[PDB]
């Protein structure tokens, strides 16, 4: 399938133990997709002060369209030193590894895989 319904745990930035997916744009997009497939991916909602507490490159989920079965359609965009790799809509948050942190909510998305 081109799209997968996922429910992503929403983490507080100060709880996150592993604050990025790796060291290159290509690695972070790769690892993000592996963790999404394995159910080991969390979501941090972007507000003032959040991104400087996480590791670059960043992997965003961005709205890809205007929401089947409650799931917003999203795709992955990476960012490194102010350059983005991909072009999409509004940021729903930044993806991070999930290693058992307690979430504050769940975000239902339809992920373009």
Curated annotation (Swiss-Prot):
It comes from the Viruses. This is Host translation inhibitor nsp1. The chain holds residues 11 to 125 of 7096 of the full protein. It is found in: Host cytoplasm. The gene is rep. Inhibits host translation by associating with the open head conformation of the 40S subunit. The C-terminus binds to and obstructs ribosomal mRNA entry tunnel. Thereby inhibits antiviral response triggered by innate immunity or interferons. The nsp1-40S ribosome complex further induces an endonucleolytic cleavage near the 5'UTR of host mRNAs, targeting them for degradation. This inhibits the integrated stress response (ISR) in the infected cell by preventing EIF2S1/eIF2-alpha phosphorylation upstream of stress granule formation and depletes host G3BP1. Residues 1-113 are annotated as: Disordered. It comes from Severe acute respiratory syndrome coronavirus 2. Residues 2-113 form the CoV Nsp1 globular domain.
